[PDB]
Design an enzyme around this catalytic site. Sequence first.
Site, short mmCIF file in Angstrom:
data_model
loop_
_atom_site.label_atom_id
_atom_site.label_comp_id
_atom_site.label_asym_id
_atom_site.label_seq_id
_atom_site.Cartn_x
_atom_site.Cartn_y
_atom_site.Cartn_z
N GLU A 1 -4.76 3.91 -11.04
CA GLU A 1 -5.50 2.61 -10.64
C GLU A 1 -6.72 2.62 -11.66
O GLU A 1 -7.08 1.44 -12.25
CB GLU A 1 -6.07 2.58 -9.41
CG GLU A 1 -4.87 2.65 -8.14
CD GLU A 1 -5.61 2.73 -6.78
OE1 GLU A 1 -6.10 1.70 -6.38
OE2 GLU A 1 -5.76 3.73 -6.41
N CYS B 1 0.80 -1.10 0.07
CA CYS B 1 0.05 0.05 -0.10
C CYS B 1 0.87 1.33 0.00
O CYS B 1 1.52 1.43 0.83
CB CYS B 1 -1.05 0.01 1.09
SG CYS B 1 -2.15 1.42 1.19
N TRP C 1 -9.12 6.97 -0.78
CA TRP C 1 -9.37 7.64 -2.11
C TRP C 1 -8.29 6.90 -3.42
O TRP C 1 -7.18 6.62 -2.82
CB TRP C 1 -9.19 9.13 -2.08
CG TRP C 1 -8.01 9.49 -1.48
CD1 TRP C 1 -6.74 9.88 -2.16
CD2 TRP C 1 -7.79 9.96 -0.26
NE1 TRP C 1 -5.95 10.19 -0.99
CE2 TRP C 1 -6.59 10.29 0.16
CE3 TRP C 1 -8.73 9.92 1.12
CZ2 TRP C 1 -5.99 10.86 1.50
CZ3 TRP C 1 -8.08 10.29 2.34
CH2 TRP C 1 -6.83 10.84 2.45
N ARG D 1 0.29 4.92 2.83
CA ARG D 1 0.27 4.61 4.16
C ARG D 1 0.71 5.76 4.99
O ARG D 1 0.21 6.20 6.15
CB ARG D 1 1.15 3.13 4.64
CG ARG D 1 0.28 1.83 4.29
CD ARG D 1 1.31 0.91 4.62
NE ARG D 1 2.32 0.60 3.73
CZ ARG D 1 3.51 -0.03 3.81
NH1 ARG D 1 3.78 -0.86 5.11
NH2 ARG D 1 4.43 -0.05 2.96
C1 HEM Z 1 -5.62 6.75 1.47
C2 HEM Z 1 -5.93 6.79 0.14
C3 HEM Z 1 -5.05 5.31 -0.23
C4 HEM Z 1 -4.36 5.19 -1.45
C5 HEM Z 1 -4.11 6.28 -2.38
C6 HEM Z 1 -4.08 3.97 -1.38
C7 HEM Z 1 -3.08 3.32 -2.43
C8 HEM Z 1 -3.28 1.82 -2.81
C9 HEM Z 1 -3.21 1.19 -4.09
C10 HEM Z 1 -2.89 2.21 -5.43
C11 HEM Z 1 -3.00 -0.10 -3.98
C12 HEM Z 1 -2.77 -1.18 -4.80
C13 HEM Z 1 -4.04 -1.25 -5.91
C14 HEM Z 1 -3.58 -1.85 -6.86
O1 HEM Z 1 -2.41 -1.43 -7.52
O2 HEM Z 1 -4.10 -2.93 -7.38
C15 HEM Z 1 -3.31 -0.48 -2.41
C16 HEM Z 1 -3.26 -1.51 -1.95
C17 HEM Z 1 -3.69 -1.78 -0.43
N1 HEM Z 1 -3.90 -0.94 0.29
FE1 HEM Z 1 -4.14 1.20 0.05
N2 HEM Z 1 -4.27 3.14 -0.24
C18 HEM Z 1 -5.26 3.86 0.35
C19 HEM Z 1 -5.73 3.59 1.61
C20 HEM Z 1 -5.84 2.54 2.25
C21 HEM Z 1 -6.82 2.18 3.35
C22 HEM Z 1 -7.67 3.17 4.09
C23 HEM Z 1 -6.22 0.72 3.65
C24 HEM Z 1 -7.11 -0.05 4.77
C25 HEM Z 1 -7.04 0.28 6.11
C26 HEM Z 1 -5.62 0.39 2.51
C27 HEM Z 1 -4.92 -0.82 2.97
C28 HEM Z 1 -4.39 -1.43 1.45
C29 HEM Z 1 -4.33 -3.14 1.47
C30 HEM Z 1 -4.38 -4.20 2.54
C31 HEM Z 1 -3.69 -3.42 -0.06
C32 HEM Z 1 -3.21 -4.61 -0.79
C33 HEM Z 1 -4.12 -4.95 -1.55
C34 HEM Z 1 -4.00 -6.55 -2.12
O3 HEM Z 1 -3.21 -7.38 -1.53
O4 HEM Z 1 -4.83 -7.00 -3.05
N3 HEM Z 1 -5.23 1.32 1.64
N4 HEM Z 1 -3.38 1.09 -1.86
C1 LIG Z 2 -8.50 1.26 0.25
C2 LIG Z 2 -8.02 1.40 -1.12
C3 LIG Z 2 -7.51 2.75 -1.73
C4 LIG Z 2 -7.04 2.78 -3.00
N1 LIG Z 2 -6.70 3.83 -3.20
N2 LIG Z 2 -6.81 1.73 -3.54
C5 LIG Z 2 -7.22 0.30 -2.99
C6 LIG Z 2 -6.85 -0.83 -3.91
C7 LIG Z 2 -8.32 -1.27 -4.72
C8 LIG Z 2 -8.42 -0.33 -5.83
N3 LIG Z 2 -8.18 -1.03 -7.12
C9 LIG Z 2 -8.23 -2.26 -6.96
C10 LIG Z 2 -8.05 -2.57 -5.38
O1 LIG Z 2 -6.94 -3.34 -5.18
C11 LIG Z 2 -6.95 -4.78 -5.20
C12 LIG Z 2 -6.83 -5.27 -6.55
C13 LIG Z 2 -7.27 -6.96 -6.61
C14 LIG Z 2 -7.63 -7.29 -7.92
C15 LIG Z 2 -9.08 -7.51 -8.26
C16 LIG Z 2 -9.60 -8.96 -7.67
C17 LIG Z 2 -9.39 -8.89 -6.26
C18 LIG Z 2 -9.74 -10.14 -5.50
C19 LIG Z 2 -10.66 -10.83 -6.28
C20 LIG Z 2 -10.99 -10.82 -7.41
F1 LIG Z 2 -11.95 -11.49 -8.08
C21 LIG Z 2 -10.62 -9.46 -8.19
C22 LIG Z 2 -7.77 0.44 -1.69
#
Ligand code: HEM
Ligand SMILES: Cc1cc(N)nc(C[C@H]2CNC[C@H]2OCCCCCc2cccc(F)c2)c1
Lengths: 407, 411
Positions: B285, B108, B280, B111
């Site tokens: 993305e 993420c 947000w 953070r």
């Molecule tokens: C404040 C705005 C936030 C932004 C801009 C952001 C940004 C991102 C982005 C771009 C990703 C990867 C998505 C992708 O490329 O598929 C991500 C992943 C992730 N974020 Fe955030 N994030 C935000 C807030 C949060 C919040 C509120 C949480 C939970 C409390 C969080 C937890 C996670 C987790 C667990 C992943 C891993 C997803 C996975 O393994 O599939 N983020 N974040």
């Molecule tokens: C909280 C948050 C904020 C932020 N800016 N972005 C994210 C991550 C989100 C936004 N775009 C995709 C998502 O991340 C997870 C991507 C996983 C691939 C889609 C998927 C996941 C799990 C099961 C599926 F079938 C398909 C999360």
Amino acid sequence: RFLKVKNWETDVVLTDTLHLKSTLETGCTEHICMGSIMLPTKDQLFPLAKEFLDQYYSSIKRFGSKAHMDRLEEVNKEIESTSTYQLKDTELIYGAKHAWRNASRCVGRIQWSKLQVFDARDCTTAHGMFNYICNHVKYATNKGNLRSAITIFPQRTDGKHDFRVWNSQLIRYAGYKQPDGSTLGDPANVQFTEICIQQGWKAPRGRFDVLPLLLQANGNDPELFQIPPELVLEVPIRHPKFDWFKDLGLKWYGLPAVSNMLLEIGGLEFSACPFSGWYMGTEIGVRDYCDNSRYNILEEVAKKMDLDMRKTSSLWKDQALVEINIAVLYSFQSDKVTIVDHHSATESFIKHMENEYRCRGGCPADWVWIVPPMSGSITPVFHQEMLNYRLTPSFEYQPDPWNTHVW
Amino acid sequence: RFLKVKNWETDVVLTDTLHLKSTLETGCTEHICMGSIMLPVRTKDQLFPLAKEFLDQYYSSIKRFGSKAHMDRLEEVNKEIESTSTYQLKDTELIYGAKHAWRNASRCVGRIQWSKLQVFDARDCTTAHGMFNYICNHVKYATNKGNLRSAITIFPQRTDGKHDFRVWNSQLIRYAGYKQPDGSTLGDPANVQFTEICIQQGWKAPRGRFDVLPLLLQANGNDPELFQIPPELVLEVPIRHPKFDWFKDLGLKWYGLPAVSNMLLEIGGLEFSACPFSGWYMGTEIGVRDYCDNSRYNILEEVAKKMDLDMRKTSSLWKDQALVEINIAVLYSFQSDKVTIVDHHSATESFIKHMENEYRCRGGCPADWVWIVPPMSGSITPVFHQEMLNYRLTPSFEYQPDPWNTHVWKG
Ligand code: HEM
Ligand SMILES: Cc1cc(N)nc(C[C@H]2CNC[C@H]2OCCCCCc2cccc(F)c2)c1
Ligand code: HEM
Ligand SMILES: Cc1cc(N)nc(C[C@H]2CNC[C@H]2OCCCCCc2cccc(F)c2)c1
Ligand SMILES: C[C@H](O)[C@H](O)[C@H]1CNc2nc(N)[nH]c(=O)c2N1
Ligand SMILES: C[C@H](O)[C@H](O)[C@H]1CNc2nc(N)[nH]c(=O)c2N1
Ligand SMILES: [Zn+2]
């Protein structure tokens, strides 16, 4: 113990078994992943020799043949006697090609088997090294029709008598200290340019001054040589749309030729082994031109495009980066110097992965280096899971020689 | 032991001690790096150690380690476990827990914001209808008419694994995809399967290119139930371009609220299998992945046709060019409508700053490079040049298998 890799774009799943023959270590543990770190005698030699000759004789369909057993004994007799051994030409060609085949950070490996190998094991002096190198540069350049090649100097002995090329590539531009606090030319090369100056080079102090080769033979002090200008094919950089582009004074060289690595075949170490192929566009356009610590030219370019540089969110950096890379590709193509773009390069590497899973049971790949430094996710490598592991024969990094060699 | 990471752009060198508190395993060994693989009842025995570790962490952060209040709380959890087999978190512990799972998410980029997180405690929730209500309120609070606020809603923990709360949607807000008999797709190809299940369960599909899917909710182990988010709760931005007036006629729009609903939150050994959270967007993305993946909306051809780029050879870099204009468009649109969004330059720069502060103050910051670096313009963003250590801390967000794969149907 068998491992699946999935492609998330195409759903194609491959099974890697080649990793079990993995020999060296990665830097990772079950507790901590080091995937993103740039760098994580008598007894040991015969094992290493045996493992190599085994894969060799297997590769030529002669596993367990008398010719196989005889070479194994011959090599063992040589080590017990001479504390080292020598490779047959055929062995050496195969080792070099396989070090390329095993380079997990190389996107261009579909080509691995078309490598011209220049056996320079008979070389003794720095002047001899120079002659070899010039011939390699000329054979490889081929008036723009680039061909992959490597030149292999004699192997390490007591490590007191190493052959080293001091340059990191055969062809690189100088970098200079200025009173300005700024940097003239390539900042990547400042220090090496100063080891030149101090060993004796008269630096012309320009933006794109081709560095003198610095060659070390049989563990002696190194010597300076200028590659003949007529052998260094260079390319003036212009844009097919922007007439002002050329006024930036940009040029790059056509031949990428890594010269600082160490090639390891069957336990033997080849500390001077310059090798070369051809550029993927992004290496020049993205990295050489746009890295902060390199030519760092985005600001100058954007201005000329009159983009709104007030906020990062207009994406002016990204717009300027695409044009620079369009200009690199266009220039090389118009001058008929071989170059590949990242779409074409990555698409080829995925076809090469499949072949290598089909025909060899796997392909070691370092995702961090394989995915281009621009437009990652629109190239297929992005969506492809990769497994990274170390096989021998291989290229390895070695410490810069100045830090090491006693002057 | 100390592990050093270097920044190749700045020569800044950092020291990680925090990896020494790592428990769960990476998937890597000394022989194989799995750093680019996507997906690499707890008995009483393990539960108290996990509770204790968490509770020691909690009590350190509030500077009461070894207090009477710390000792008494370990005792009380001890007893609750031996007698009922599980235990209940205090509000304070749950909030601390959910913030840290975020803080520990190594994939993420967002953070820097981890400590500003609104926690909605839905552990009194008993039915699917009740789940609807909690989720509507989350979405309304988080949205805030465009000035997005990060929030998480936490439903009751796993018990025997037979009474699980799940949100079947992968995000609370996402578009339907439909697979056509000719083989093409209408809407978002990614959500085809999930769309299929909603149709099966009684949803009447509009069959458009941007139909907001219904929520599909499982309370207490029961069969899931359908519900439509009130459309007035669903903020959307139509996408247009600052200089290209034909861009609007492509018909694109996207929703403002990215809200992950399929992850499992782990705290002190307890498993919260329904814990949708939201923040947000970073522009890429939507503009890189959602629009330009071949497996998604895939609008690259159409965009470059209209820009009249030379499309007969990949080396014109026409895709790279179209990709940039789309991303300019996404960011332009969100900003014009005053819906919070961050660009990838600004997002990675903030991240590097957070990452450094975390090494200074906490002794580390686990980070996954494959994920942190944006999928466009990688090397002109400062993370590219950043070495990173990846390891797993709890509390944590984990993957869990899609619930239609495991659910035992009651009918
Ligand atoms: C404040 C705005 C936030 C932004 C801009 C952001 C940004 C991102 C982005 C771009 C990703 C990867 C998505 C992708 O490329 O598929 C991500 C992943 C992730 N974020 Fe955030 N994030 C935000 C807030 C949060 C919040 C509120 C949480 C939970 C409390 C969080 C937890 C996670 C987790 C667990 C992943 C891993 C997803 C996975 O393994 O599939 N983020 N974040
Ligand atoms: C909280 C948050 C904020 C932020 N800016 N972005 C994210 C991550 C989100 C936004 N775009 C995709 C998502 O991340 C997870 C991507 C996983 C691939 C889609 C998927 C996941 C799990 C099961 C599926 F079938 C398909 C999360
Ligand atoms: C034929 C065209 C070739 C292409 C298009 C190509 C492509 C590349 C690229 C883009 C990189 C990453 C460069 C960087 O970002 O620093 C690389 C690394 C590498 N390639 Fe190639 N390559 C080619 C030929 C060769 C040859 C002929 C060899 C050796 C025989 C080779 C072996 C290596 C090795 C060892 C590395 C990584 C070195 C390291 O660990 O730093 N490649 N290749
Ligand atoms: C053979 C070949 C073909 C091709 N197209 N590209 C390459 C790679 C070349 C071209 N551009 C960079 C060079 O690769 C070298 C990468 C090494 C950098 C790592 C390093 C080594 C030593 C000291 C450092 F500080 C850092 C090699
Ligand atoms: C196989 C590979 O790891 C996979 O495609 C990853 C790569 N990096 C990513 N990075 C982000 N931010 N999001 C993703 O979905 C992915 N996909
Ligand atoms: C720190 C990180 O490992 C480093 O920036 C890597 C990332 N990927 C790279 N990829 C290539 N092809 N070349 C590089 O020099 C790097 N640098
Ligand atoms: Zn690893």
